[PDB]
């Protein structure tokens, strides 16, 4: 069987202000188990910390904040790996540009080293300009994740993907995108979660994202019904994963 897991956060044990008790009992299984695990996120916007209280206080689960590894980590991680100037532009939130901030990276709006694009609820056609100059003067362009779009109450609504878009479409250069599916946050991912990538599994409820992330990289995938892709959706699907699931409590530790 599978001997570590990478987990997807929103939609696989929790869907947006709801509960998925099964997802609840899918980490607290494994860990009673002992099996390693790793919540991988494309959320930027949160820290680690903010992530793991809102765990255990809205939805029953207690982790480690080494078992959360979001795309804001992987970024700064590359960012370092990159080892360019230690300057950056970022448009993003709270949890994105302080980790940054954090790794020693000073904001600079002319030419920065970097110019780094999560999603910002409250982005503005300057920071949108700021950007667009900056990375036509030749800073390494990164997206923090492609996600086209961000579930909430009002609806979908526009993602990092589509501000990386905007961008993409005013420098006519393609931005590195970090998140899943892409394979950045997947080997870092895989390397923090100490297992082969031969025996790590990936599980989520969102196709393009998670079982991509599997698909692309060559990491065995499950995909659970719950959020996302609909079970209506899975006849159709161009790639089946190598297991579906309607619910985590079928799936056999």
């Given at each position: 069987p599978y001997k570590?897991?990478?987990i997807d956060l929103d939609g696989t044990i929790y869907q947006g202000k709801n509960r998925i008790p099964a997802g609840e009992r899918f980490i607290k299984r494994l860990q009673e188990r002992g099996i390693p695990y790793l919540l991988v996120t494309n959320n930027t916007t949160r820290?680690?910390?903010?992530?793991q209280s809102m765990l255990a206080n809205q939805f029953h689960v207690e982790t480690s904040i080494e078992t959360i590894y979001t795309a804001?980590?992987?970024?700064?991680?590359?960012?370092?790996?990159?080892?360019?100037?230690?300057?950056?532009?970022?448009?993003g939130?709270?949890?994105?540009?302080?980790?940054?901030?954090?790794?020693?990276y000073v904001e600079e709006l002319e030419n920065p080293a970097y110019v780094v694009v999560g999603l910002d609820s409250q982005v503005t056609y300057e920071m949108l300009a700021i950007a667009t100059l900056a990375i036509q003067k030749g800073a390494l362009f990164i997206g923090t994740n492609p996600d086209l779009n961000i579930p909430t109450e009002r609806g979908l609504m526009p993602g990092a993907g589509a501000l990386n878009a905007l961008l993409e479409a005013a420098t006519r250069v393609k931005p590195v995108f970090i998140g899943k599916p892409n394979a950045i946050i997947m080997n870092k991912s895989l390397e923090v979660l100490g297992i082969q990538r031969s025996e790590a599994v990936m599980v989520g409820d969102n196709y393009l994202t998670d079982i991509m992330a599997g698909i692309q990289n060559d990491i065995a995938t499950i995909l659970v019904t719950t959020g996302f892709t609909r079970p209506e959706e899975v006849p159709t699907l161009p790639i089946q994963p190598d297991h579906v699931l309607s619910s985590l409590d079928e799936w056999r530790l």
């Open positions: 570590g897991y990478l820290t680690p910390e903010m992530v804001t980590m992987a970024t700064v991680d590359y960012m370092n790996d990159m080892n360019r100037g230690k300057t950056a532009y970022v448009i939130e709270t949890g994105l540009k302080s980790a940054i901030a954090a790794a020693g």
